UniProtKB/Swiss-Prot annotation:
Summary of the function given for this chain in its UniProt record: Suppression of A.tumefaciens oncogenicity.
Record keywords: Plasmid
Xref: InterPro entries: FiwA/Osa, PFIN
Protein name (database record): Protein osa
Source species taxonomy: Bacteria, Pseudomonadati, Pseudomonadota, Gammaproteobacteria, Enterobacterales
Keyword Methyltransferase part of the UniProt annotation: no
A Pfam family matched in the record: PFIN
Species name: Shigella flexneri
Superkingdom of the organism of origin: Bacteria
């Protein structure tokens, strides 16, 4: 859309904005996803969405070996921007996320609700030019939807415990939990 210098400077400024927002909101309670009973036999969260109907997501597509990390949206956004501007998985600014070609399709799925919760994104910690970043196996557009709608905290899926703990370290609001253990807890309690 513009030149490289433009795109790098813009990303830089947004990261700096996030740095400050994160520093200000530090320690304050965020709105958490809520594990809810549902018509299926799966883990489903209700996600509050500011000035918007509730969203619902599910870990139905996860492996027993996967781990869930509840992430601070702003921190996740920042780590994604740390991928840089040229990556094929480069993160658009929030204001530009709805322009993404898959975004209407994502918005449509999110519109349905508890009858069809959106499966979690599969992400991974990584290293880019000597710094921490997050990249994707899948779920980039649904991640944009959540970010652009200012969902405060949402779950994501990670391939293994160490990767999950690393994600939680940099962008998490709590320790990870293995999908198999969460499914079993939901079973025994709900
Ligand atoms: Cl599930």
């Amino acid at each position: 859309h513009h030149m490289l210098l433009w795109r790098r400077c813009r990303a830089w400024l947004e990261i700096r904005r996030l740095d400050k927002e994160l520093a200000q909101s530090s320690g304050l309670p965020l709105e958490l996803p809520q594990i809810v009973p549902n018509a299926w036999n799966e883990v489903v969260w209700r996600l509050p969405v500011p000035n918007h109907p509730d969203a619902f997501m599910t870990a139905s597509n996860a492996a027993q070996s996967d781990f869930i990390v509840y992430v601070n949206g702003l921190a996740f956004y920042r780590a994604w921007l740390a991928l840089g501007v040229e990556d094929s998985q480069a993160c658009p600014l929030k204001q530009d996320m709805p322009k993404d070609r898959k975004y209407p399709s994502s918005a449509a799925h999110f519109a349905v609700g508890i009858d069809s919760p959106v499966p979690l994104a599969d992400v991974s910690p990584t290293m880019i030019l000597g710094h921490f970043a997050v990249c994707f196996t899948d779920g980039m557009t649904r991640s944009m939807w959540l970010l652009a709608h200012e969902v405060a905290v949402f779950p994501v899926l990670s391939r293994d415990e160490a990767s999950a703990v690393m994600l939680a370290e940099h962008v998490g609001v709590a320790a990870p939990i293995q999908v198999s253990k969460l499914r079993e807890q939901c079973r025994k309690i709900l």
